[PDB]
Design an enzyme around this catalytic site. Structure first.
Site, PDB file in Angstrom:
ATOM      1  N   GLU B 232       0.835  -1.194   0.000  1.00 22.09           N
ATOM      2  CA  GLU B 232       0.000   0.000   0.000  1.00 22.09           C
ATOM      3  C   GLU B 232       0.872   1.248   0.000  1.00 22.09           C
ATOM      4  O   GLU B 232       0.530   2.243  -0.655  1.00 22.09           O
ATOM      5  CB  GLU B 232      -0.919   0.033   1.228  1.00 22.09           C
ATOM      6  N   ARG B 310      -8.412   2.867  13.384  1.00 23.35           N
ATOM      7  CA  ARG B 310      -9.183   1.643  13.132  1.00 23.35           C
ATOM      8  C   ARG B 310      -9.214   0.750  14.383  1.00 23.35           C
ATOM      9  O   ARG B 310     -10.268   0.206  14.730  1.00 23.35           O
ATOM     10  CB  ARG B 310      -8.658   0.839  11.935  1.00 23.35           C
ATOM     11  N   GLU B 691     -10.671  -8.086   4.228  1.00 17.44           N
ATOM     12  CA  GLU B 691     -10.101  -8.070   5.584  1.00 17.44           C
ATOM     13  C   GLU B 691     -11.006  -8.587   6.699  1.00 17.44           C
ATOM     14  O   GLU B 691     -10.498  -9.172   7.645  1.00 17.44           O
ATOM     15  CB  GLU B 691      -9.704  -6.652   5.992  1.00 17.44           C
TER      16      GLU B 691
HETATM   17  N1  LIG Z   1      -5.130 -13.142  -2.814  1.00 20.72           N
HETATM   18  C1  LIG Z   1      -5.123 -11.985  -2.099  1.00 20.72           C
HETATM   19  N2  LIG Z   1      -6.218 -11.635  -1.373  1.00 20.72           N
HETATM   20  C2  LIG Z   1      -6.222 -10.466  -0.677  1.00 20.72           C
HETATM   21  C3  LIG Z   1      -5.021  -9.593  -0.646  1.00 20.72           C
HETATM   22  C4  LIG Z   1      -3.876 -10.060  -1.443  1.00 20.72           C
HETATM   23  O1  LIG Z   1      -2.823  -9.385  -1.491  1.00 20.72           O
HETATM   24  N3  LIG Z   1      -4.001 -11.223  -2.109  1.00 20.72           N
HETATM   25  N4  LIG Z   1      -5.006  -8.432   0.088  1.00 20.72           N
HETATM   26  C5  LIG Z   1      -6.028  -8.270   1.113  1.00 20.72           C
HETATM   27  C6  LIG Z   1      -6.151  -6.864   1.630  1.00 20.72           C
HETATM   28  S1  LIG Z   1      -5.006  -6.361   2.786  1.00 20.72           S
HETATM   29  C7  LIG Z   1      -7.134  -6.056   1.182  1.00 20.72           C
HETATM   30  S2  LIG Z   1      -7.309  -4.490   1.825  1.00 20.72           S
HETATM   31  C8  LIG Z   1      -8.100  -6.506   0.093  1.00 20.72           C
HETATM   32  C9  LIG Z   1      -7.996  -5.452  -1.007  1.00 20.72           C
HETATM   33  O2  LIG Z   1      -8.746  -5.798  -2.171  1.00 20.72           O
HETATM   34  P1  LIG Z   1     -10.333  -5.453  -2.229  1.00 20.72           P
HETATM   35  O3  LIG Z   1     -10.506  -4.034  -1.738  1.00 20.72           O
HETATM   36  O4  LIG Z   1     -10.585  -5.614  -3.722  1.00 20.72           O
HETATM   37  O5  LIG Z   1     -10.935  -6.526  -1.375  1.00 20.72           O
HETATM   38  O6  LIG Z   1      -7.783  -7.803  -0.438  1.00 20.72           O
HETATM   39  C10 LIG Z   1      -7.378  -8.725   0.569  1.00 20.72           C
HETATM   40  N5  LIG Z   1      -7.301 -10.067   0.026  1.00 20.72           N
HETATM   41  N1  LIG Z   2      -5.612   0.223   4.244  1.00 19.10           N
HETATM   42  C1  LIG Z   2      -6.078   1.391   4.729  1.00 19.10           C
HETATM   43  N2  LIG Z   2      -5.380   2.530   4.437  1.00 19.10           N
HETATM   44  C2  LIG Z   2      -5.826   3.711   4.938  1.00 19.10           C
HETATM   45  N3  LIG Z   2      -5.324   4.947   4.811  1.00 19.10           N
HETATM   46  C3  LIG Z   2      -6.164   5.764   5.516  1.00 19.10           C
HETATM   47  N4  LIG Z   2      -7.200   5.071   6.077  1.00 19.10           N
HETATM   48  C4  LIG Z   2      -7.030   3.785   5.764  1.00 19.10           C
HETATM   49  C5  LIG Z   2      -7.733   2.503   6.019  1.00 19.10           C
HETATM   50  O1  LIG Z   2      -8.772   2.490   6.721  1.00 19.10           O
HETATM   51  N5  LIG Z   2      -7.204   1.374   5.495  1.00 19.10           N
HETATM   52  O1  MOS Z   3      -6.304  -2.387   3.753  1.00 21.69           O
HETATM   53 MO1  MOS Z   3      -5.293  -3.938   2.989  1.00 21.69          MO
HETATM   54  O2  MOS Z   3      -4.189  -3.082   1.999  1.00 21.69           O
HETATM   55  S1  MOS Z   3      -4.224  -3.956   4.839  1.00 21.69           S
END
Ligand SMILES: Nc1nc2c(c(=O)[nH]1)N[C@H]1C(S)=C(S)[C@@H](COP(=O)(O)O)O[C@H]1N2
Ligand SMILES: Nc1nc2[nH]cnc2c(=O)[nH]1
Ligand code: MOS
Ligand SMILES: Cc1cc2nc3c(=O)[nH]c(=O)nc-3n(C[C@H](O)[C@H](O)[C@H](O)COP(=O)(O)OP(=O)(O)OC[C@H]3O[C@@H](n4cnc5c(N)ncnc54)[C@H](O)[C@@H]3O)c2cc1C
Ligand code: MOS
Ligand code: FES
Ligand code: FES
Ligand code: FES
Ligand code: FES
Lengths: 334, 756, 164, 151, 51, 164
Positions: B232, B310, B691
Site C-alpha cells: 500500500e 481503526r 479483511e
Molecule cells: N489473494 C489476495 N487476497 C487479498 C489480498 C492479497 O494481497 N491477495 N489483500 C487483502 C487486503 S489487505 C485487502 S485491503 C483486500 C484489497 O482488495 P479489495 O478491496 O478488492 O478486497 O484484499 C485482501 N485479500
Molecule cells: N488500508 C487502509 N489505508 C488507509 N489509509 C487511511 N485510512 C485507511 C484505512 O482504513 N485502510
Molecule cells: O487495507 Mo489492505 O491493503 S491492509
C-alpha cells in the site's frame, strides 16, 4: 463452487517423453568434468579414486552434493569456496548396503532414499529390530518438502553439523557408524559426543570425506525414541531435538546402556553423559525418572542470556521428551 | 449475467501455466541494469563512512547511489518524515543508505555485500516499554470515550485489569517487492512497472525525488503476487531507488527483493501492547471498559495513525458497552516502519477485546458463548463512536454457526476428552466479528473508471484498483457484463495505470469492489444512455450493430465513471458522524487439541459463517474468507518475528518464520456465506470481504486458551477462576510454558514447586 | 579449459560452454533461457515457488527416475545429463493445459497465482512417480510449497480428484 | 495532485506541431502556463476509435475536444476557486482532490452540418475553406532545361 | 495565454539534440527479433513455389 | 586471428575486439553503443540523416582535421584511431545545448525533427573548420542533407546568425 465431472481425464501414457537424446548419452562412460567461473572452479569427480586424489591435492576444496547448505552459506553468509568438488556421481557414495549390523547408506544418498529404504525395512522386519530406523523416520516427518529431501544428502546433514540437526542426535544416541576416507586412510567410528568438537566442526581431517553411514538394527532389550521441537526461531540454534536409547540387561528393566543426545541446547549436538552414566544398573522406575530429570535440568542448564532464548521452554522440553521416552519404554517393556 | 456465479479468477489458467506475467517476468531491455539496496546494520547510529572501494572491483559494477545523487528531494514517505537514502544518521536496522547498480542481479548482490559502512552508535529504543519509558511517540494520544467510566466501575460487581501483547507479522506475499523503471530520455519522462497497490503514491513519490512534474511519470501495475497491505505504501522504498538509478544512468533498471531483504526493510503489522480494565456484573454483562493501546510504529509515521484509529473503532468488537474509554499512542522506535497489513489495526483491537471477554466469562464461571451472546449488540444499537448498526447480522451468523458446527454436542465431546486424557487436552471456542467498511480518511473513499467500447463491440475497462489475487478484475468484469447486458467474453481489463485513471486511492480497506464497482457501473450507464437511441431504432439488432451505428453517427464510445462514498466523516471532537459505510460480519467456531507435554497442537475443525451480502462471486468470496482466516490463524498461533537485543531481525525467511503450511489448516474446514442478506449500501447488494474474516483466525487462539485452561485444571492448581496471561502469537513455547506441571516447575526432579 | 555442461529443459538440449559453478538453475531458467514460469520466493528452499521436476537415467538403479527439486538451490553444474521440466513443459493455455493445471485453476486453488507453478510441479511430480496416488500421498506432497492467499483447502480439494 | 496536467487526444504528431497547438489551447482554456501541461503520446487505451490524423482538420477537431475537457475541469474547480480566491492553481486542485471531485475528464467534438450527397448534389461537403495566393518567378536555361527559382 | 504567439515546436530542442525518441530509437528487448519483408519481383504472376 | 579496432566516440574510447568488416558506423552507433540521435534515412548517402563529424591527425597538413561523413556508408574498419562526434557529443537538453542546436530549434528549423541531428552535425562541422563562415559557405554546407518538412528557409535563416 466447481464441477469435477467436467475435468479432462488424466492419460499417464501421454506425458512428455524422457529426452531420447539424453537416453543415448547414458552409454557414454562418466569422466571427470571441470567448470570455471568468475570466482569458483568446480570439479565433478567420476570415481572415488579421483575424489581422494583431488582432496589430497586440494584439502581446502569444498564438497557439494545437494548444495542445500552450501547454497545458503554462499548466498546468505557470503562464504566463498574457490574450489568445489561434487562427488555425487561416485557409486560408493550412493550405495545402499544391507549388512549383519544395520543398513549402510553412501554419504551422497538423498534423504528421500534413506526414508524410502527405512520405511521398507520397518514394514518387513520385526519391531524389535527397527527401533533406531523408526527414530530416524520420525525425525524425517515434518522435516522439509519433497523437493529438499530429494536432493539433500544424508552425509551433507551430518557434516553440516548444525546445532539443530534433527538427525545427528539420533545418530549419536544410536552409535551410528561412520566410514571416513582420504588418500591412504580408511577408518570407521561410531558417532559419539567427541565427533562434534565445536561449532559447525566434526572430527574429520581436512582431506577426509564421509563415505558411508551405517544405521544399526536395534537389539533385544533395546528401545529408541526421537523427538523434536515444533517451532524454530533462529537460523541454527535453540530448537530442541533429540535421540534417546536404552539397552537393558537381558529380559530385565535394569539399565545396561543409556544415551540421551540433544540438539538445540548448545552450539553443537551433545550427550547428557553425566546424567546417563549415573543410571547404569538402575531399574526403569519413578526414581530413575526423577534422577534423570534432575540430571538433565543441571547438565543441560542454560544461562538467562543463552543464545536463542526460550530458556524455560527448552529446559521443559528436555525433561518432557525424556518423560515421553520413559513412558514409551514402559509400554514396550510390558 | 454472471453476478452471483462462482466464476474462476480470470487469470487462474494462465497462473497455473506460468504464462501470467509478474513484474520480474517482464523481459529485460538489452541495456537494463539491476539495483541492490545497501541498508543499515545498526538500530540507531551516525554514518561515519561508506566505502565502495571493494564494490567497485566487482565485475559489472556500474555505480553506488546515495543521497548526494538525488536531483530533487531526499524527503519522502506518506508524512514526509523519511529519507529516500539516509544521509547522516540511520534509525533502524534495514534503513536504506544507498544502492549498488550493476549489470546482473548476481553482480549487484556481490557488490552490495562488500560495501563497508562505519557507524557511531546512538541510544536506541526498540520495545514498546522502551518507548513508553522514554516518552517516544508520534503525535498525541488518540481517544474515544462514551458514558461515565467512574459510574460504570462503581456499578460493577467485578473488575479485572491486565496487560496483553500481540506480536507483529510479516506480509509474506509470495512475490516480494519489485520495480522496473524505464527512463525515456525526454523531458524527464519515466515509465515504471511496479508490484504495488498504490500507483498514485508511487508516481508522486518518484516525481518528487526526481524534481519533475507528476505528469512525466507513468506507473503501470498488471498484477501483484500478493500485497496484503504491505504494498500500500512501502513499495515506494524500492520504486524510488530504482527510479533514481534509471535517472542517473539513463538505462532501464530493475530490482526485485530477496525474501531476507523484504522481511527486514519493508515493515509489517504493528505489534500492540494493551493495558485494560473491565467492570462487569456477576451475570457477565459489561458495564465499564478502559483500554490503553500502544502500537510499535517503527521509524516513521506511515499509516500508523490511521491504523490506531481503526483499532479504536474496533475495541468493542460485537459488544454493547455503555461506559467505555479507549486510547491509543504510536510508539516511535528504531525498527523498520510498520504499515498496513490485512485488517489495519482491527485484528489487534479485536483480539484485545476477546481477551478481556474471555476473562469475564472465566471470572463469572459462565459458559463463554452465553456471556458473548448476552453482551452482543442488537439491531439499531449505536457503537462507542455513535454509529448505528443497521442490518446487524451477527445474531444470524452466530445461530447458524452454532447449529452447523454442532457446537453444543462437540462441547460435551471436548469435556469428555479432557476427562479421559492427562497430557493432551481439547478446546473449543466460538467468536464473532464486525469490521467497518471504508477508509478511515474520508477523502480516500473515491474511485474512478475509464471504459472504451471499440468498433468490434469489444470493451476495455480500466479502473483505479489493482489485482493482487483477490479477484478484483474478475468482479469488475462480472459487474460490467451485468450492467451492459453483454457476455463477459466481450470485456477485458489489461492493467491499472496512472495515465488512464489518475489520483487513485491505494487498493485497500477492503472497499475496492464497492467503489470501483460503482465507478465501472456508472461508466456503463453512460455508454448505455449513448447507445439507447440506436437500440431504439434497431431493437432486434446486436450489440455490435448498435456500437457500429453509434460510431458512424459520431457518438463517443468512451467515458469516465466516478464514485464518492456518501455521508462519511467521523469527528473525534463531537464523537459523531459515520466512520464507515456499513459493517461486514461473521462468526467462527474452532476446535483444537494441544499436546500439553510439547506445546504442539492440531487444528481439528473450523466452521465459519460470513455475511458478505449478496456475493458477486461465491467462489472468490469463500476464497477470501478461507485465505483471510488462515492468515489470522498464522498471526495468532504460528508467526513470530524475533529481534536481537540490539534490534536486528533474526527471522528473515521461511526457515525461521513459519506461515501456515498445507498441513496447518483445520482438518475439517467449513465456510458458509450467509443467505438472504442483501446489502443496500453497495454494488449489486454485495459486501466487502477482503479483511473482515481475518480476525476469525483468533477462534483458534481462544480454543487453544480453553485447552490450556483444561491443562492447568489437570496439573497446575485448583483455581477454576484463575486468569493467566497468554500473549499472541500462542506458539508452542507459550502454550507449553502455560501448561504448568511437574516439568515446568521442576517438581519432577524432587524440588518443591508451584503445581499440585 | 572448461568442459561443456549439457542438460535438457522441457525436452530441448542445452549446451552451456562456459558454466559458472555459482549459477543456480532458477537464474539459468529465468535469465538465460527466458522461461519465467518458475519463480523466486525465498532463495532458501522453504517456499517451493521455484519447484521443478528433474529426470535422469540413474546408472546405479538402472532406470529413469523423476523427482522434484528447488531450482533456487540447484547448481546448474550438478545437472550434467539431467532433464529439467518446468511449468511450461507440461501444458499451456495456447496449446492444452495439463490436468494438474486445469484442476487447480477450476477449483479456485489460484488467487494471486505466484505459488501456482511450484504447486503444479509438486503435484505433477507425484503423478509421474505414482499415477494412482492415495489421498494421503497427495495431502503430504506439498510440505515444501507455501501459499499465502488461498488457505490451501481448494488446492487439496481439486487435487483429491486424482486419488483413490 | 501537484497541479500538473496530462493531455491525451486522438491526434498524432508528425512534425506539424499538433501537440504544441493543443498545449497552447489547453493553457489558454485552463488559464495556466504551458509549463504545467504535457502531452506524452497518442494511444488507443486513452482515446479509442480515433480517425487518422489527416485532412488538415486535427487542430480544429482535437482543439475543440481539448477545449471541452478543459471547460469540464474549470467547472469542477470553480467552487474551490471561490473558497480560496487568492490561492493558487495547485491549492485549488488539491482542495478538489480532497473533496473527492474527479480531476479526470473526456472531451469530444463532432463537426456539425456535414453530409454531401452525390445523388442530390447538395449538403455541405466541407466545414469551410482555406485560401491562398502565390506568385513565383523563374529563369530557365533553354539549352539545358535547368532553371532557377528566383522569387 | 500563448495562442497567437510564435512558440517553437515543443519537441524542437530535443529533436536538435537527438534526445527525441522515434520508433526505432526505442531500446531493444534482450530477446527482440527483426523482420524483413519478402516481396514480389513480378507485376502479375502465380506463385509457383517458395524456397 | 584478428586485430583490435580502436576509435573514439564523443571522447570515449571504443575497443572493438571483433570488428566485422561489413559493419557500418551507423549500425555500430545505434545498435552497439546505443547512441540513437544519428538516424537512418536512406543507407545510400543521399539524405545526410546519418551525418557525423570525424576528426583525425593529418600527417601531410600537420594538423587535426575535422570533416563530416555519412555514418550509413562509413565502415567501422576505416576508423582506427579516428574520433567520432555525434549529435549527443555537442550538447543536450539535460546539460546545455550547443549554439547550433539552440538556434535551429528557436528559429523553427525543426518540424518532425528526423533530419535535425544530421543538419546540426553539418553546421557544427562547418563551424569547427570556420568559426566565422560567410553566408555563402553556410548554404553550401548542406547539399548532403534533405528535409521534407520545413522548406529549408527557417534553417538557413537561423544559421545565418553565425555569419559575418
Ligand atoms: N489473494 C489476495 N487476497 C487479498 C489480498 C492479497 O494481497 N491477495 N489483500 C487483502 C487486503 S489487505 C485487502 S485491503 C483486500 C484489497 O482488495 P479489495 O478491496 O478488492 O478486497 O484484499 C485482501 N485479500
Ligand atoms: N488500508 C487502509 N489505508 C488507509 N489509509 C487511511 N485510512 C485507511 C484505512 O482504513 N485502510
Ligand atoms: O487495507 Mo489492505 O491493503 S491492509
Ligand atoms: C528448506 C530446508 C529445510 C531443512 N530442514 C531441516 C530440518 O528440519 N532438520 C535438519 O536436520 N536439517 C534440515 N535441513 C538441512 C538439510 O538436511 C541439509 O542442508 C542437507 O542434508 C545437506 O546435504 P547437501 O547434500 O545439500 O549438502 P551440501 O550443501 O552440498 O554440503 C553440506 C556440507 O557437507 C559437506 N559434505 C557434503 N558431503 C560430504 C561428504 N560426503 N564428506 C564430507 N563432507 C561432506 C559439504 O562440504 C558442506 O560443508 C533443511 C534444509 C532445507 C534447505
Ligand atoms: O490528409 Mo494528409 O494525411 S494526405
Ligand atoms: S525460491 Fe523459495 S524454495 Fe526456491
Ligand atoms: S495464490 Fe497467492 S501465494 Fe498462492
Ligand atoms: S542514411 Fe541517408 S545518407 Fe546515410
Ligand atoms: S524536420 Fe522533418 S525532415 Fe526535416
Amino acid at each position: 463452487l466447481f464441477n469435477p465431472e467436467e475435468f479432462m481425464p488424466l492419460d499417464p501414457t501421454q506425458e512428455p517423453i524422457f529426452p531420447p537424446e539424453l537416453l543415448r548419452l547414458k552409454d557414454v562412460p562418466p569422466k571427470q568434468l571441470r567448470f570455471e567461473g568468475e570466482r569458483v572452479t568446480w570439479i565433478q569427480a567420476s570415481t572415488l579414486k579421483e575424489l581422494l586424489d583431488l582432496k589430497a591435492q586440494h584439502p581446502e576444496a569444498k564438497l557439494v552434493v545437494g548444495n542445500t547448505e552450501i547454497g545458503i552459506e554462499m548466498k546468505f553468509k557470503n562464504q566463498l569456496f574457490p574450489m568445489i568438488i561434487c562427488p555425487a556421481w561416485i557409486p560408493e557414495l550412493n550405495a545402499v548396503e544391507h549388512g549383519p549390523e544395520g543398513i549402510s547408506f553412501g554419504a551422497a544418498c538423498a534423504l528421500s532414499s534413506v526414508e524410502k529404504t527405512l520405511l521398507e525395512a520397518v514394514a518387513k522386519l520385526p519391531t524389535q529390530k527397527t527401533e533406531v530406523f523408526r527414530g530416524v523416520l520420525e525425525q524425517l516427518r515434518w522435516f522439509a518438502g519433497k523437493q529438499v529431501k530429494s536432493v539433500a544428502s544424508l552425509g551433507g546433514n551430518i557434516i553440516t553439523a548444525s546445532p539443530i540437526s534433527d538427525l545427528n542426535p539420533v545418530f549419536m544416541a544410536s552409535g551410528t557408524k561412520l566410514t571416513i576416507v582420504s588418500r591412504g586412510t580408511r577408518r570407521t567410528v561410531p558417532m559419539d559426543h567427541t565427533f562434534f568438537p565445536s561449532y559447525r566442526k566434526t572430527l574429520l581431517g581436512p582431506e577426509e570425506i564421509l563415505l558411508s553411514i551405517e544405521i544399526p538394527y536395534s537389539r533385544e532389550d533395546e528401545f529408541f525414541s526421537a523427538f523434536k521441537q515444533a517451532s524454530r526461531r533462529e537460523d541454527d540454534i535453540a530448537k530442541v531435538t533429540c535421540g534417546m536409547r536404552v539397552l537393558f540387561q537381558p529380559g530385565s528393566m535394569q539399565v545396561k546402556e543409556l544415551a540421551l543426545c540433544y540438539g538445540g541446547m548448545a552450539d553443537r549436538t551433545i550427550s547428557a553423559l553425566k546424567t546417563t552414566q549415573k543410571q547404569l544398573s538402575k531399574f526403569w522406575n519413578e526414581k530413575l525418572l526423577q534422577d534423570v530429570c534432575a540430571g538433565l535440568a543441571e547438565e543441560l542448564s542454560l544461562s538467562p542470556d543463552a543464545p536463542g532464548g526460550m530458556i524455560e521452554f527448552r529446559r521443559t522440553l528436555t525433561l518432557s521428551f525424556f518423560f515421553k521416552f520413559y513412558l514409551t519404554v514402559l509400554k514396550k517393556l510390558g | 449475467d454472471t453476478v452471483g456465479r462462482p466464476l474462476p479468477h480470470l487469470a487462474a489458467a494462465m497462473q497455473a501455466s506460468g504464462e501470467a506475467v509478474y513484474c520480474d517476468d517482464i523481459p529485460r531491455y538489452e541495456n537494463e541494469l539491476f539495483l541492490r539496496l545497501v541498508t543499515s546494520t545498526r538500530a540507531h547510529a551516525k554514518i561515519k563512512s561508506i566505502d565502495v572501494s571493494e564494490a567497485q572491483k566487482v565485475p559489472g559494477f556500474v555505480c553506488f547511489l546515495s543521497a548526494d545523487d538525488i536531483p530533487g528531494s531526499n524527503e519522502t514517505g506518506l508524512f514526509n518524515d523519511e529519507t529516500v537514502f539516509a544521509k547522516d544518521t540511520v534509525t533502524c536496522v534495514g534503513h536504506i543508505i544507498g544502492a549498488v547498480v550493476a549489470d546482473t542481479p548476481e553482480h549487484a548482490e556481490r557488490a552490495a555485500h562488500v560495501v563497508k559502512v562505519t557507524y557511531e552508535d546512538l541510544p536506541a529504543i526498540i520495545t514498546i516499554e522502551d518507548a513508553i519509558k522514554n516518552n517516544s511517540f508520534y503525535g498525541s494520544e488518540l481517544k474515544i470515550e462514551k458514558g461515565d467510566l467512574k459510574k460504570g466501575f462503581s456499578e460493577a460487581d467485578n473488575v479485572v485489569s491486565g496487560e496483553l501483547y500481540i506480536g507483529g507479522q510479516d506480509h509474506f506475499y509470495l512475490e516480494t517487492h519489485c520495480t522496473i523503471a524505464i527512463p525515456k530520455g525526454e523531458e524527464g519522462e519515466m515509465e515504471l512497472f511496479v508490484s504495488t497497490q498504490n500507483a498514485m503514491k508511487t508516481q508522486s513519490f518518484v516525481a518528487k525525488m526526481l524534481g519533475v512534474p507528476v505528469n512525466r511519470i507513468l506507473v503501470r501495475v498488471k498484477r501483484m503476487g500478493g500485497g496484503f497491505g504491505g504494498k500500500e505504501t512501502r513499495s515506494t522504498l524500492v520504486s524510488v531507488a530504482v527510479a533514481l538509478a534509471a535517472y542517473k544512468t539513463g538505462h532501464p533498471v530493475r530490482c526485485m527483493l530477496d525474501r531476507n531483504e523484504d522481511m527486514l526493510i519493508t515493515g509489517g503489522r504493528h505489534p500492540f501492547l494493551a493495558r485494560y480494565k473491565v467492570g462487569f456484573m456477576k451475570t457477565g454483562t459489561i458495564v465499564a471498559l478502559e483500554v490503553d493501546h500502544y502500537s510499535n510504529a517503527g521509524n516513521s509515521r506511515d499509516l500508523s495513525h490511521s491504523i490506531m484509529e481503526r483499532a479504536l473503532f474496533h475495541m468493542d468488537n460485537c459488544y454493547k458497552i455503555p461506559n467505555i474509554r479507549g486510547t491509543g499512542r504510536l510508539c516511535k522506535t528504531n525498527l523498520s516502519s510498520n504499515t498496513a497489513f490485512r485488517g489495519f489495526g482491527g485484528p489487534q483491537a479485536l483480539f484485545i477485546a476477546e481477551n478481556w471477554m474471555s476473562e469475564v466469562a472465566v471470572t463469572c464461571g459462565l459458559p463463554a458463548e452465553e456471556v458473548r451472546w448476552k453482551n452482543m449488540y442488537k439491531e439499531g444499537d449505536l457503537t462507542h463512536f455513535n454509529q448505528r448498526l443497521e442490518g446487524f447480522s451477527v445474531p444470524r451468523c452466530w445461530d447458524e454457526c452454532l447449529k452447523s458446527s454442532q457446537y453444543y454436542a462437540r462441547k460435551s465431546e471436548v469435556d469428555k476428552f479432557n476427562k479421559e486424557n492427562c497430557w493432551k487436552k481439547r478446546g473449543l471456542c466460538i467468536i464473532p466479528t464486525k469490521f467497518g467498511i471504508s477508509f478511515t480518511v474520508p477523502f480516500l473513499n473515491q474511485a474512478g473508471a475509464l471504459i472504451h467500447v471499440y468498433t468490434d463491440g469489444s470493451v476495455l475497462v480500466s479502473h483505479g484498483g489493482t489485482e493482487m489475487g483477490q479477484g478484483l478484475h474478475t468482479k469488475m468484469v462480472q459487474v460490467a457484463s451485468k450492467a451492459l447486458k453483454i457476455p463477459i467474453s466481450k470485456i477485458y481489463i489489461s492493467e491499472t495505470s496512472t495515465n488512464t485513471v489518475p489520483n487513485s486511492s491505494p487498493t485497500a480497506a477492503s472497499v475496492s469492489t464497492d467503489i470501483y464497482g460503482q465507478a465501472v457501473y456508472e461508466a456503463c450507464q453512460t455508454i448505455l444512455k449513448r447507445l439507447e437511441p440506436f437500440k431504439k431504432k434497431n431493437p432486434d439488432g446486436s450489440w455490435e450493430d448498435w456500437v457500429m451505428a453509434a460510431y458512424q453517427d459520431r457518438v463517443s464510445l468512451s467515458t469516465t465513471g466516478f464514485y464518492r462514498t456518501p455521508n462519511l466523516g467521523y469527528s473525534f471532537e463531537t464523537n459523531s458522524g459515520n466512520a464507515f459505510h456499513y459493517f461486514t460480519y461473521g462468526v467462527a467456531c474452532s476446535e483444537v487439541e494441544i499436546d500439553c507435554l510439547t506445546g504442539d497442537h492440531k487444528n481439528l475443525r473450523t466452521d465459519i459463517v460470513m455475511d458478505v451480502g449478496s456475493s458477486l462471486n461465491p467462489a472468490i468470496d469463500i476464497g477470501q474468507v478461507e485465505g483471510a482466516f488462515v492468515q489470522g490463524l498464522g498471526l495468532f498461533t504460528l508467526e513470530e518475528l524475533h529481534y536481537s537485543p540490539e534490534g536486528s531481525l533474526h527471522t528473515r525467511g521461511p526457515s525461521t518464520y513459519k506461515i501456515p503450511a498445507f498441513g496447518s489448516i483445520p482438518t475439517e474446514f467449513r465456510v458458509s456465506l450467509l443467505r438472504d442478506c442483501p446489502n443496500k449500501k453497495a454494488i449489486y447488494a454485495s459486501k466487502a470481504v477482503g479483511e473482515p474474516p481475518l480476525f476469525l483466525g483468533a477462534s483458534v487462539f481462544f480454543a487453544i486458551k480453553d485447552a490450556i485452561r483444561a491443562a492447568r485444571a489437570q496439573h497446575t492448581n485448583n483455581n477454576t477462576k484463575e486468569l493467566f496471561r497468554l500473549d499472541s502469537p500462542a506458539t508452542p513455547e507459550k502454550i507449553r510454558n502455560a501448561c504448568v506441571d511437574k516439568f515446568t516447575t521442576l517438581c519432577v526432579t524432587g524440588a518443591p514447586g508451584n503445581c499440585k | 579449459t572448461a568442459d561443456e555442461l549439457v542438460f535438457f529443459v522441457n525436452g530441448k538440449k542445452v549446451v552451456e560452454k562456459n558454466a559458472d559453478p555459482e549459477t543456480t538453475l532458477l537464474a539459468y531458467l529465468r535469465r538465460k533461457l527466458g522461461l519465467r514460469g518458475t519463480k523466486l520466493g525465498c532463495g532458501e528452499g522453504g517456499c517451493g515457488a521455484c519447484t521443478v521436476m528433474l529426470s535422469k537415467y540413474d546408472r546405479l538403479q538402472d532406470k529413469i527416475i523423476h523427482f522434484s527439486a528447488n531450482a533456487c538451490l540447484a547448481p546448474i553444474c550438478t545437472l550434467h545429463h539431467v532433464a529439467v521440466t518446468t511449468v511450461e513443459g507440461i501444458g499451456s493455455t495456447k496449446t492444452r493445459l495439463h490436468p494438474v493445471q486445469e484442476r487447480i485453476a477450476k477449483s479456485h486453488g489460484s488467487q494471486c497465482g505466484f505459488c501456482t507453478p511450484g504447486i503444479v510441479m509438486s503435484m505433477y511430480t507425484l503423478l509421474r512417480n505414482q499415477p494412482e496416488p492415495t489421498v494421503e500421498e497427495i495431502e503430504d506432497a506439498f510440505q515444501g510449497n507455501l501459499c499465502r492467499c488461498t488457505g490451501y483447502r481448494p488446492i487439496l480439494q481439486g487435487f483429491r480428484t486424482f486419488a483413490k
